[PDB]
Swiss-Prot record, chains B, G:
PTM entry text: Contains two covalently linked phycoerythrobilin chromophores and one covalently linked phycourobilin chromophore.
Binding positions for phycourobilin per the UniProt entry: 50, 61
Protein family according to the UniProt entry: Belongs to the phycobiliprotein family.
Coiled-coil residue windows: none
Pfam families xrefs: Phycobilisome (PF00502)
Subunit structure: Heteromer of 6 alpha, 6 beta and one gamma chain.
Designated name of the protein: B-phycoerythrin beta chain
A GO BP annotation: photosynthesis
UniProt organism field: Porphyridium purpureum (Red alga)
Record's keyword terms, sorted: Antenna complex, Bile pigment, Chloroplast, Chromophore, Electron transport, Membrane, Methylation, Photosynthesis, Phycobilisome, Plastid, Thylakoid, Transport
Binding site for (2R,3E)-phycoerythrobilin 1: 82
Function: Light-harvesting photosynthetic bile pigment-protein from the phycobiliprotein complex.
Membrane topology value: Peripheral membrane protein
């Protein structure tokens, strides 16, 4: 519990620290529990067998099972006692062949099947690549699982309908330019003024014409009803100071064979812009 | 029946809108996280027989009056139909996980399942518990937290897929209620 | 919609089975092909008002008889409905590149179209001449990429063969 | 009706279980929002007349056939009943926002609304446009400060937007 | 000095002690001979180009008005 | 013979339509996923004589009662027909890898099996227990590539759910 | 100099530690709001040249003694240099906001400033007001509440960045006081 | 601290400029690449004692002269410092997987490292004999993902190229 490289790797809680199978044991306080399981059932003399689940098998614990171990200390006592087996002593993996049973340190009989190099301890499976190491000091034998051994008697009150069902909350993907426009349409029209028509949106180009007749936002403004009796004379000015530009000098660009023209006639309101305008520039008057 | 891409098409068709810009990024994310979805649908249909038998058995072990005379799952004709009522419900949930939308689960399965279960006399509390057991099995195989099997995957997080398929199973309990 | 997902789900629903290994192998084709057909669906959705109006008067540049009395391009309303009905068809091609099949074109544009364009006397070779103009206007490196133009034109002549 | 606290209790009584320790810690977060939820219900209710009227004003600008003779909002009784329905939906969406659960929303407004508009001929695609215009007038009113302390309310505006989408798909 | 320090300690040695940051610049030009006093120009245009820049370098040996500073002497 | 090709040709025939763009996209997924399973099938080909021998011993180890007089494994002749009947299942999954779907299993190995085995008094759990062994001795970067093990496992669980 | 990632590896090195899965839980949240941080540095450098002259000119029009004869901002030589160092100060703060750590604001700029302004004779009670006005501006640009120029972002909340930049503009107020 | 950030703000300080669009674009790549190294970092931070012991005895297995008298590893207390230094380097490599660059390895591990091991007679090829053991030991999907294996074993042979 200090320097793993100190005193080589011949200490008992420094050998398993330097074997990279299960570093979850010393990460939490499960190292202290299984040294007190081996004292309460007097296993310091008899040869026995342990099944240690590796790193990776600690990570695939369920979220509802792990919270049962963080709040009942007798449950993590009974679970870790079920990985120490006193049935056939310091067995290797060649004596786990066939179908039989094994007896734990505390729990009830746990059945095994072993078919060649594939050995199941029941709810788990022995990883044979690393698994036939034996200790002569404190004498016992160690094998590696891929899952925790967890009996069905201990999971009779874990559940996924208690608060462990997964959720992901939905989001709204609005923009700052869109929400600054729509918030002017929440004032009354006696207050908001031109901002009362800020909820309307841009439609397709054909929607503004003759069966449909959708109204643009410029027509709600007083600029659409400007018709003064006064007029500029245009002969007051000096010659050279009146400018005139067309939109095109091309006949089928100004009016095609169809009547769909941007420039001439009543079809110049059929355009993909100009349904909405900027009346958030000035004021609520 | 709509998939994920055709769900945003029937939402754009309601307002004569083209699909592009803002909506295409949420669908390009569906393609980028698309290898996970096939890798998670495979995890459920590989274990689809053990999932159904364990769900109807676990429904019976907690409520053992269902196999009495007067219980709904009494005889062999009734137990074999309850084992098949749940094998179809799991099949339609795996369609909605593959599609990314719950329209195939609602159109072909849940629309009419309520008045199916009140004509036969199926207890809705017991059938919700059998679905609930299948929900815990589906999240466990997707997130690899199964205590009886250890499937091989690439490394990564798939919490959004598990919270997706959990919402499909809760539609089954809300429909037949 | 007829898609890649909805085909392999319906085929495994009529057989009454789970999604097999060959039903997941088809959705992998939906991944490797989505890069090309979403480029075409985004290029179209940004420049659609200029693509529709360029093809709407390619109808009347080939068929100037539609402004004659009694025809389908007489007045302002009838050309507003004509440029609308072309814009409807270009929206459905944008929907088909997104979904991945001929789903929205079949259910919303093609089914029932022969009985409407004959009852209302709209010449179906002029709902084609605008679609055929767009298919030959496309320059394969200029507007989109190579495989994005293969997908864009293949949904464009599905509509031509369905009106013919 | 039952709110979000009563929702998990009813799910736990039908199993015959005490609530978990994880489930109490998830209901502490719902009380921890608490005041931010009451700010959204305050902002939506305080501007309720202007949200309904200015989103009816914008509906008749884009669909002006509804107020032509032979349209579904042409007369005084048929226009006043249209504004009355848009205030009914905004009422039960604010009821569902203070409760955290869409149960009063469908059991007292939405169940039978599609059947009503199909017997009367009311265009259901135009009702959902009026619902979607009150939505973004209200989710833009939700995330402006205006006398609220600065913080992140982006998880409660996704819940308010989800009640407007629920009312819109139960009529379209 | 901040843009020739290899270490993050050496950065701190130049910020706090200004007479070291001075002579750390000056010592680098002595050993890596990048002074004026070590540069022989290899052409007649370079002898113009070197003369063009130190007319500006000598131009800060005078004040803002053109009277002589105490530096260049 | 369910494959990716056979599923879209039969679905285009059921609606009377030509091969669309939704059908060629599914053939693209057959091209990408081919290199995964076609070298798993190459691995199963030259090393099938040892895989069925390892799997054959893994069911008489679990069910040692089969060698009793009056059971399905009495003599050497009934033992030889069990190593034969598990070599057939390893040939039929070698066919499913080169086809691309669960076709050759659904025809020649699965359909008709649960009435042959019931009548001939053979326990299906022991035809299971050798299939679940080679699923378990397979570790993904040694026996094959990382993606070949996904396909090789996908058919063994399909055979297991069929017998069970 | 340090940034937000070199700051957690000089605190873990002091205890000869590795960095856990719990020391990483703030760094995965740092790169999760990483787009919002670039999106707020760019809101400040785009108004940078205007912000300085906004601020030095407010410093003059509150305290007109700065431009009196014998003042500190008297000549054109001296007024030009005050507009330089009000821009050197704002340049180094946006380095701290971009890196998420005041190690470059407090070592390259502030290490020696207080005795330097004593040597020249810069008034301190006015040069707090220069940095105080630039603090009022930079939280208006980040929170998009500047009264005369809005910008265009995705909708959300940036109150966390708006106080980190307020936490950087008053180290300058403290390292010359 | 050579980081991605500290590079683009040092070049922007030598020239007196503000941050610009090339600088913000550089920190954008500190988001995509960041995930594949922040999980190589936690993979080493959990299992560091097993790799410091696996590599520590790889120094001595190749050079068995190192435990002779007069050499560097003659007694156990010198061996306890030798296993300490391999732990000192893996803690620095874990730091470079967090800050993104080669900040801590240069400032704390290589700066001055060359003339101390010459002075204290430490054979420096025994240092690289353990890091090159750690390099060729990694399994490609087992230990970490494939992008973590190129990001973790890039900082290794930067240290190997530095020390030799
Ligand atoms: C702008 C709104 C759209 C629209 C609305 C519209 N609705 C009606 C009529 C009714 N709506 C209801 C529905 C409710 N009444 C309730 O009290 C409640 C609360 C639980 C609901 C959900 C009912 C019962 C009626 C009929 C009785 C009446 O109010 O007159 C009408 C009038 C239809 C008519 O023929 O009079 C309209 C116009 N219609 C539109 O065009 C808009 C899109
Ligand atoms: C099939 C054999 C799979 C498998 C399925 C899983 N079942 C999981 C949980 C679970 N199982 C039961 C039924 C069981 N409990 C009982 O009390 C009785 C008898 C009365 C039985 C048959 C229940 C009730 C539950 C819990 C459901 C819930 O949470 O509400 C499960 C989850 C985790 C895990 O076990 O790893 C899975 C994956 N498990 C397997 O190993 C094989 C492959
Ligand atoms: C221009 C290319 C044509 C022309 C075309 C007209 N088409 C007309 C009407 C029309 N078009 C459709 C199909 C369209 N509506 C849809 O909803 C969809 C898909 C979503 C599509 C493709 C329909 C159903 C109709 C009739 C309903 C209507 O009035 O819109 C049309 C109007 C006919 C009329 O006025 O009676 C015209 C004029 N006109 C031309 O000159 C060339 C042939
Ligand atoms: C993965 C679980 C383990 C691992 C297991 C070992 N397997 C060993 C030998 C072996 N395994 C198989 C079956 C497998 N390999 C194949 O090529 C195929 C089919 C294509 C399958 C199902 C066979 C046939 C053999 C013998 C030939 C050989 O590989 O030498 C093995 C050696 C000991 C033994 O079982 O005899 C081990 C350790 N190896 C690993 O590294 C991971 C942890
Ligand atoms: C708080 C300061 C603002 C606000 C900020 C948000 N910005 C969000 C997203 C965002 N910003 C950018 C541009 C940024 N990223 C870059 O890579 C570069 C240049 C290299 C820049 C300038 C991007 C690309 C994004 C992502 C969204 C998109 O796809 O366009 C954002 C959303 C959260 C998030 O993305 O994590 C917020 C909240 N928004 C505000 O309302 C205040 C005023
Ligand atoms: C003409 C001598 C000016 C000039 C005038 C322009 N005014 C424009 C719009 C505009 N003008 C007013 C003020 C007007 N409305 C009122 O109610 C009252 C008093 C009661 C007054 C004097 C308003 C409110 C507006 C905006 C409303 C609207 O646009 O309808 C205008 C149009 C600018 C534009 O929109 O681009 C012009 C050109 N401009 C000149 O150059 C000379 C100096
Ligand atoms: C390729 C054959 C030629 C070439 C042709 C030109 N195309 C020109 C303009 C143009 N082309 C299209 C169609 C294309 N762009 C799109 O965005 C889409 C669909 C979304 C398609 C099918 C459009 C819409 C336009 C007008 C807009 C524009 O590009 O200015 C063009 C200019 C003359 C013209 O106005 O037609 C030419 C010469 N260009 C080439 O370089 C190769 C040789
Ligand atoms: C989210 C959409 C808003 C936002 C909300 C916040 N409100 C915060 C605190 C707060 N709100 C209220 C008013 C509320 N409580 C009531 O009892 C009643 C009426 C009966 C109402 C309307 C109060 C009284 C408080 C004080 C409680 C407190 O300060 O904790 C708040 C917390 C501030 C923080 O922790 O940062 C938030 C975030 N703020 C926003 O910016 C958006 C727009
Ligand atoms: C302006 C808002 C102040 C003010 C400033 C004056 N500064 C004067 C000279 C000066 N200023 C600095 C600051 C700056 N330069 C740096 O390199 C760095 C950090 C990297 C900082 C903060 C320095 C170093 C100097 C002296 C060297 C030089 O001028 O080049 C100055 C001129 C004094 C004079 O000409 O006698 C002024 C007026 N004065 C004010 O009143 C406001 C508060
Ligand atoms: C083990 C693989 C070596 C070996 C190592 C020895 N190192 C000795 C001393 C030593 N090592 C360092 C570098 C180290 N200290 C650090 O703080 C860091 C990085 C942060 C590193 C890499 C220093 C500075 C020192 C001197 C101070 C000290 O003793 O801790 C050492 C003792 C030498 C002596 O007593 O003179 C040994 C034996 N020796 C080997 O045989 C292999 C090659
Ligand atoms: C920082 C990352 C990191 C790692 C990768 C592992 C490194 C590592 N691998 C093994 C253990 C192993 N590693 C491998 C893997 C392989 N052997 C080969 O020849 C192939 C190159 C490769 C197959 C892909 C095998 C087969 C074993 C078991 C045999 C053994 O223990 O040597 C062990 C000892 C037992 C164990 O912990 O599992 C350790 C520490 N630990 C770490 O902290
Ligand atoms: C080509 C067709 C195809 C298959 C044969 C299967 C198999 C499969 N799974 C993944 C790949 C993956 N699969 C998962 C899924 C998971 N990983 C976990 O840790 C969780 C336990 C589980 C559900 C969340 C993840 C996280 C990836 C990594 C790639 C990604 O994130 O998209 C990949 C991509 C790896 C690669 O690029 O080579 C493939 C091919 N899925 C397919 O798409
Ligand atoms: C081409 C596809 C193809 C198949 C998949 C198999 C399927 C199959 N297996 C058997 C046949 C058999 N299967 C077994 C198997 C067993 N008995 C035991 O002791 C164990 C329970 C188990 C070992 C695995 C035995 C013993 C027979 C022969 C039955 C008998 O002799 O009565 C038979 C009957 C005909 C025969 O082989 O005698 C058939 C059709 N055969 C095929 O042709
Ligand atoms: C006597 C002279 C005198 C001044 C010069 C100003 C100086 C000044 N500006 C601001 C406050 C501010 N100053 C700016 C700066 C700017 N605003 C912009 O839109 C441009 C980008 C930039 C001008 C170039 C900003 C953005 C704010 C925050 C509020 C806002 O304008 O939206 C403040 C704090 C609050 C306030 O009073 O507004 C002060 C004192 N005030 C004065 O009394």
């Amino acid at each position: 519990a200090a320097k793993p490289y100190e005193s080589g790797y011949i200490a008992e809680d420094d050998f398993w620290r330097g074997r990279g199978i299960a570093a979850w044991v010393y990460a939490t306080g499960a190292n202290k529990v299984i040294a007190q399981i081996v004292k309460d059932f007097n296993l310091t003399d008899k040869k026995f067998m342990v099944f240690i689940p590796n790193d990776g098998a600690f990570a695939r614990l369920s979220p509802q099972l792990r919270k049962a171990m963080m709040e009942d200390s007798r449950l993590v006592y009974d679970m870790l006692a079920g990985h120490i087996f006193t049935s056939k002593g310091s067995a290797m993996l060649k004596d786990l062949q066939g179908a039989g049973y094994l007896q734990p340190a505390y729990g009830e009989a746990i059945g095994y099947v072993g078919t060649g190099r594939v050995i199941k301890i029941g709810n788990a499976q022995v990883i044979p690549e690393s698994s036939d190491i034996l200790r002569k000091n404190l004498g016992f034998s160690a094998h590696t699982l891929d899952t925790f051994i967890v009996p069905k008697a201990l999971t009779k009150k874990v559940s996924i309908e208690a608060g462990f069902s997964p959720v992901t909350p939905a989001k709204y993907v609005s923009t700052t330019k869109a929400d600054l426009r729509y918030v002017g349409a929440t004032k009354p029209a006696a207050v908001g003024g031109r901002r009362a028509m800020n909820l309307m949106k841009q439609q397709p180009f054909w929607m503004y014409g003759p069966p449909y007749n959708a109204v643009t936002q410029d027509e709600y403004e007083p600029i659409s009803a400007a018709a003064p009796k006064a007029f500029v004379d245009y002969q007051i000015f000096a010659p050279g100071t009146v400018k005139v530009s067309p939109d095109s000098v091309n006949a089928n660009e100004l009016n095609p064979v169809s009547g769909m023209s941007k420039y001439i006639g009543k079809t110049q309101k059929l355009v993909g812009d100009q349904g909405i305008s900027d009346r958030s520039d000035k004021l609520p008057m | 029946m709509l998939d994920a891409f055709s769900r945003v098409v029937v939402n754009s068709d309601a307002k004569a809108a083209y699909v592009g810009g803002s909506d295409l990024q949420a669908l390009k994310s569906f393609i980028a996280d698309g290898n996970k979805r096939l890798d998670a649908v495979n995890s459920i249909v590989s274990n689809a027989s053990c999932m159904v038998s364990d769900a109807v058995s676990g429904m019976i072990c907690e409520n053992p009056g269902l196999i009495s005379p007067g219980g709904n799952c009494y005889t062999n004709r009734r137990m074999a139909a309850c084992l098949r009522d749940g094998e179809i419900i799991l099949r339609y949930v795996s369609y909605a996980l593959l599609a990314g939308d719950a329209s195939v689960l609602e159109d072909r399965c849940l629309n009419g399942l309520k008045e199916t279960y009140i004509a036969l006399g199926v207890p809705t509390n017991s059938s919700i518990r059998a679905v609930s057991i299948m929900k815990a099995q589906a999240v466990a195989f997707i997130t690899n937290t199964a205590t009886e099997r250890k499937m091989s995957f690439a490394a990564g997080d798939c919490t959004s897929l598990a919270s997706e398929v959990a919402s499909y199973f809760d539609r089954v309990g809300a429909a037949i209620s | 919609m007829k898609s890649v997902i909805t085909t392999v789900v319906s085929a495994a629903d009529a057989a009454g089975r789970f999604p097999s290994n060959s039903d997941l192998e088809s959705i992998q084709g939906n991944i490797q092909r989505s890069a090309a057909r979403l480029e075409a669906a985004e290029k179209l959705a940004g420049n659609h008002e200029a693509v529709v109006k360029e093809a709407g008067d390619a109808c009347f540049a080939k068929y100037a008889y539609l402004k004659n009395p009694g025809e389908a391009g007489e007045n302002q309303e009838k050309i507003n409905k004509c440029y609308r009905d072309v814009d409807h068809y270009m929206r459905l091609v944008n929907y088909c590149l997104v979904v991945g099949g001929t789903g929205p074109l079949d259910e919303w544009g093609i089914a029932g179209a022969r009985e409407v364009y004959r009852t209302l006397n709209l010449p179906t070779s002029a709902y084609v001449a605008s679609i055929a103009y767009t298919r030959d206007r496309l320059c394969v490196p200029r507007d989109m990429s190579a495989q994005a133009g293969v997908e864009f034109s293949a949904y464009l002549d599905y509509l031509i063969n369905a009106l013919s | 009706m039952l709110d979000a606290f009563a929702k998990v209790v009813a799910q736990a009584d039908a199993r015959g279980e005490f609530l978990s320790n994880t489930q109490i810690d998830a209901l502490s977060k719902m009380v921890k929002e608490g005041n931010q939820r009451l700010d959204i219900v305050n902002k939506v209710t305080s501007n309720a007349s202007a949200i309904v009227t200015n989103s009816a004003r914008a509906l008749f600008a884009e669909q002006p056939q509804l107020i032509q003779p032979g349209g579904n909002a042409y007369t005084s009784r048929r226009m006043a009943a249209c504004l009355r329905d848009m205030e009914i939906v905004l009422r039960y969406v604010s009821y569902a926002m203070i409760a955290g659960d869409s149960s009063v929303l469908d059991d007292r407004c939405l169940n039978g609304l599609r059947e009503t508009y199909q017997a009367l001929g009311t265009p259901g695609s135009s009702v959902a446009v009026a619902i979607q215009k009150m939505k973004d007038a209200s989710v833009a009113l939700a995330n402006d400060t205006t006398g609220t302390p600065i913080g992140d309310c982006s998880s409660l505006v996704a819940e308010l937007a989800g009640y407007f989408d629920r009312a819109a798909v139960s009529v379209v | 000095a901040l843009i020739l320090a290899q270490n993050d300690h050496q950065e701190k040695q130049y910020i706090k002690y200004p007479k070291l940051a001075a002579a750390a610049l000056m010592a680098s030009t002595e050993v890596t001979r990048a002074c004026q006093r070590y540069a022989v120009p290899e052409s007649i245009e370079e002898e113009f180009l070197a003369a063009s820049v130190d007319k500006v370098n000598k131009m800060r040996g005078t004040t803002a008005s053109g009277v002589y500073k105490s530096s260049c002497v």
